[PDB]
C-alpha cells in the first residue's frame, strides 16, 4: 500500500516553512511508449526552481527535508506491462566510456533524465538487486499507483540543497508496454511530490 | 619471573589484540541517528530480488520469461535449478551474491512469480518442484504427481513457492496446463518474472573471497 | 549466525598497500610517503561498497624487510601526518621533527610496529558514495574521507645502499554500517570514479535455452 | 589409571611432517605447500585407527632452520588455506594476499610459531573408516576429513640461495573417541587404502610345539 | 541371550514406515560345509532390493534405521563345531594384492559374500580381536541361535542408503564342522532381519 | 618490572600451553549422540579375545587346541605362560596389544575355556596353574597338588580360571584326566578355545611406542 | 522369495511339531 523508507517517518532535527512550502507539486507528465527506457529525477534538485520551495532552498545556506512522492499511471485494461519504482540514497551515475558524467545527467532538473543502460542502472550495479532500496511495483493489471515516503538520510545534520543530492527516484519498465492496434500508444506517467518537515537555515 | 612461550614475537595472524592510541585525547565527532543501519548480512539474503531465468545466449530482457499461445497444450515453459551458489539464474539475486563470500550455507528458500499480462488474459500454469535426488519430469503428468501448484492468471496475479531445505539439488519447472486465452483486440503474449529470497532459517559458514 | 554479522564480515587484517623507500638505485631519495587508501585493491573496494555510510577505527601493522627477506637491525622512522598537515619534502626536512606528527622508531629486527588510528572524519561516518559537488573532476568526491599519509623513513646520516620493502596491514574495529547497496557487476575502470566500460557484461552466465544438468 | 585414558593416550606433540622450500638449487621455486595429513606416518596411523570416529582440536608448531642448523633472521610467511580455498601458484601469486587466509609472519630467529586449528569437519566427527562411495578409486574415501594446506613462503624480492627446512608438530586436544576397532596386524601397502599383501604374517610368533621356557 | 549393541536401543531422531516395512525378512539359507569359510552381508545393502523396505530406501533421498538380526542353525546332536557372529560398524574390506576391491565384494547384495582370508577378516585386522565388536557365539552343542540388536550409529543424523553401508554382519566358523559318515553333510544357516525405527526423507 | 628465567624461549617439549585461535568466531558443527564412546583404554583390556595357544610352526587353525583319544590316560594337552606383554599366545589378545604401548602393568587376569566337541562327547580335563617362581609340573599328580580344577565336558561346556596377580611369571597347563569317550557314529576328536582378558584391578604405566 | 513377502510363517521341525494357519475369510480364492 504505502512504503515507509527504512521504517521511519521524517521528522525535525532554523526557520520552518508551513503550508506554502508543503503542498503537492505535480511535475509534467512523462509518456511511456513501448520503446521507452527509464527515468530518474534525483531530487532535491527537481524543486529548486519551482515555487516557494525553490525560493527557500536557493537563498538559505543549509537545508533539511523529507519527501512524500506519489507515482501514478493511466492505462486502459487492454494495456499490459510492469514498472519498478525505487528511491536510492546517494545515487551516483557514471559514464560508459567508448570520463566524467555531464551536469545535465547528474542534475537532470524538473524534467528528469532517460536511462541509457537501465540494466546496470548507469551505476555499473545490477538492476536485479535494485530491490534492496525502498521500492514498489506498478503492474498495469493489478494497480495504477505507487507511493514512497523518504525520511531525511545524510551523514551531516544539514547540508546544502544546490550542491548535494540526497537521493534519486528511478522509474523503470522491466516488462515492456504492449497494446493491440487501435489503442492509445503512449501511457502517461505523472509524478507528485510533497516535502515533509523541511527546515532552512542561514538566510 | 616470567618465561617466553613458543608463540612470542609473531604477527602472522588475525589475532584480535590491543594497540596504543596514536592520538590520545582526540575526540571523534559524536554519533547522530542515521536511518537504515543493517547489523547482519543474513537479513540481506531475505529480500526478494529479480532472478534471471532467461539468461539465454540481451540486456533487461534476460529478467523475464515469455509466455504465449503455443497451440500445444502440455508443454514446458521454463526450468531452473534451485542452488543459489552455483553459476546461473541466482547470480542476479542478492542471496546468490553473498553466498559467494562463504563456504557453506543451508536453509529454505522461496520463489515468487508475477504475471505481467493484460487484465483480460486468462489461463493456468503448473509449477513443479523436484527433490535433489530426482531428475526433472519428462511430462506434465509426471510433474503433478510430486510437489506442485496450479496457478490461474485471472484469479491470482502472483504466487509463491517455498522450497523445503537445500545445501551447497532440486529443480523447478513450469508447465502449460491450458492454452493462453484472450478476448479480441488484446495482445497474445505476456511475461512472468521470478524473485528469489531466503527464509529465516538460512545460515552461512566460513567466509571466503569471491 | 555470528559469521554473517556486519562486524565479523569486515573482521580480519589484510594487506592495504606495499611501498618501498629505495635509496639504493638511481633513486637516492631515501624515504617514501603513503596516503592512506582503504580501497586501493578491488577485492576490498567491492566489499566496502555494500554500504553507503560506515564508521570504524583502524589498526595498522608494518611488516618490513630487505630484498633478501633479511632483517638486520637498522633504524626506521614511521611518522603519521594527520589530515591537514604538510608532508615531508626530503630526508632532512623539518616535518620529520614536528612533535604533533606522531612517529614510531623501530628496528628492522623488532617485531612489526603496530598503532591504532581513531575515526578521523568531520562527518559522523565515511561516505563511499557522494552525489554532488563539494564546491567535472569534482563530481562524486568526498574530501572528508582522508585519513592521513604515514611516510616511513630510514634514520640515516646519508645514503645507505639498501632498499627497504614494507607491507601495510589494516584491521577494521567497532564497525557500524548503514543503508545497503548492491554489489558491482561491471569491472572497474579507474580508482575514484564509478565509470564502466561500453561493453556490458551479463550478470548470469549463458545456457543453451530457457528449458535447459 | 589416568595414563590409560583415551585423552592421555593421544596427548603429546609429535612430528606430523617435514617439508622444505628449496629455492637454492635447480629448484628456484621458493615456496612449498603441505596438505595437513595426520596419518602420514604409520606409527600414528595405527594408534588413530583404534577408533572409528573421533573429534579433536589441533595445535601446530613450526620448527625451522637452515641446512647448517643455523637460524639467521630472515622473514618467512606461514599461511593457512582452509578447506575449500585455492592454493598459491607461485611466490608472487595473489593468494598470498587474500585476508581470509590466516597468515603468520615470523623470523627464523624467533622461537617457533604456534597456532591452534579448530574442528573443521562438516560431520560431527572425523571418520577414519568409511564404507561406501562418496558419489573404484572412490571406495572408502572421506572428502570431509580435509583440514587445509598451510603453505610456508619466504618473503623475498627474488631468489635467495638458501634452503629452509621446517618441521611440523601437532597436538591433539579435547579428544573424544567412539566405537573401538582392533589394531592392524598386517603391514600397510599404500597410504589411503586398507590393502594388504598376499603373504599373510601371523599375529603370534612360533614355538616348537603346543606343549612348549 | 540377547545382545544390545553398545548398550542402546534404536530410536527415532520425515515419513515413518509402519508394519509393512518393519516385518521379518528371511534371507535364503546358507549351507555350512566342513570346508566352508565365512560370510558377510553388509546391510542396509541387503534389503535395498527386497520388499517394501527396498521400495522406500531407493526413492527417498535420506535414510535412518536400526536392525534386529537373528542367526540360527539346524544341526543334529552328532554334528560339532562353533561359529562367531559379529556386527562391525563401518566394515571396510580390502584387496590382497599379488588395488581396489570390486563392487561385488564391497556390496555383496542379499546373498552375502565369502571370506577369502577370514583370519585377517579381509581388513588386515586379526579375527582374534573381532570380539571387540558386538558379538555372540553359536556352539552346536550349547545353542543353535544368536541375536543382536544394532542401533543406528553414524556421524551424520541421516545418510543415503545406496551409497553408504552402516555396518556389516559376519558369520565365521572358527572351529570347523565335523560329522561321522551317514550324517547330513551341509548344516543350514538362516538369517532373519527386522528393521527397527526406520525413517525416510526427501521422496 | 620482570626478569626472564632460564627456560624462556624453548619449545622442546610436551608442555600443555595455550595458542591463539587461527579462526576466531568460527562455529564447529555441534555434537550429536554417537553410541559407543570409550573414554579409557583400560576397559578395552577387559574384553575377552581369542588367544593363540597353538601357534606352532597355519591360519585360523592357530586359534584352537586339539583334543582327541590319545590312549595314554595321563598326558599333557597343552601349556602356555601367563604374561601378556611377552611374545607368544597373548599377542592375539587385546590386552596383550595395548600392553605393548606401556612400560609397566599389574593386576589379575582370567582365562576362559570352551569345549567345541559334539553333544555326545564326555570326559575330564585337569587345568593347573603354577606360580611365577616354580617350574611347570612334570606329571599330572604334581599338577593337582597346587592350584587346579577338574573340568567335565558333559556337565560343563565352559570353565573360567582367574590367575591371582602378575607383573611384567606363571604357567598354566592342561592335562588329560580321563580318555575321550564317545558313543558310536560320533567324531572322535574335538577342539578347545581360550579367551584372555584382564580384571578390574589391572593398571598401566608410562606410555611407550610399540 | 516372492512367497515370504506376503503372509507366511517359517516353521521348525525340532522346536515345533505342529503349526496352525488361519486363513482370513473366503466365499464360494486363495492358495497356500
Numbering used by the authors:
A (entry chain B), E (entry chain B): 30 to 42, 53 to 137, 146 to 250
B (entry chain C), F (entry chain C): 3 to 59, 62 to 172, 189 to 230
C (entry chain A), D (entry chain A): 71 to 205, 214 to 290, 304
G (entry chain C): 145 to 172, 189 to 192
Show passages lifted from the paper:
The bottom band had a λ260/λ280 absorbance ratio of 1.65 with particles sedimenting at 128S and composed of capsid proteins VP1, VP2, and VP3 but no VP4 (lane 3), and contained packaged genome as verified by negative staining. Hence, the bottom band unexpectedly contained particles more like uncoating intermediates (or A-particles) as opposed to mature virions of other picornaviruses. In addition, the high infectivity of the CVA6 A-particle was measured to be 3.6 × 107 TCID50/mg, which demonstrates that A-particles can infect cells efficiently. The above results indicate that the isolated CVA6 A-particle is biochemically similar to the uncoating intermediates of other picornaviruses, but functions as a mature virus that has a stable structure and is highly infectious. The CVA6 A-particle contains characteristic structural features that are typically attributed solely to picornavirus A-particles. These include large, open channels at the icosahedral 2-fold (2f-channel) and quasi 3-fold axes (q3f-channel), and a collapsed hydrophobic pocket beneath VP1 ‘canyon’. The 2f-channel in CVA6 has dimensions of 36 Å × 8 Å, which are both similar to that in the CVA16 A-particle and the EV71 A-particle, whereas the channel is closed in the EV71 virion. In contrast to other known enteroviruses, CVA6 A-particles display unique interactions between its capsid and the packaged genome. The cryoEM density map and atomic model of the A-particle together reveal that the N-termini of VP2 and VP3 interact with the genomic RNA near the icosahedral 2- and 5-fold axes, respectively. The N-termini of five VP3 subunits extend beneath the VP1 ‘cooling tower’ to form a well-defined annulus with the key residue P3 making close interactions with the genomic RNA. Here, the CVA6 A-particle examined in this study, unlike the classical, mature picornavirion and instead more like a stable uncoating intermediate, may require only minimal conformational change in its capsid to enable release of the genomic RNA.
Although highly effective vaccines exist for EV71, no vaccine is available for the global public health threats imposed by CVA6, which underscores the critical need for developing an effective vaccine. Here, we demonstrate the isolation of two stable CVA6 particles with excellent natural antigenicity: one empty (CVA6 procapsid) and the other infectious (CVA6 A-particle). The capsid structures of CVA6 procapsid and A-particle at near atomic (~3 Å) resolution both closely resemble those of the uncoating intermediates of other enteroviruses. The cryoEM structures of the CVA6 procapsid, A-particle, and A-particle-1D5 immune-complex we report here reveal atomic resolution details about molecular determinants in CVA6 related to virus neutralization, cell binding, and RNA release.
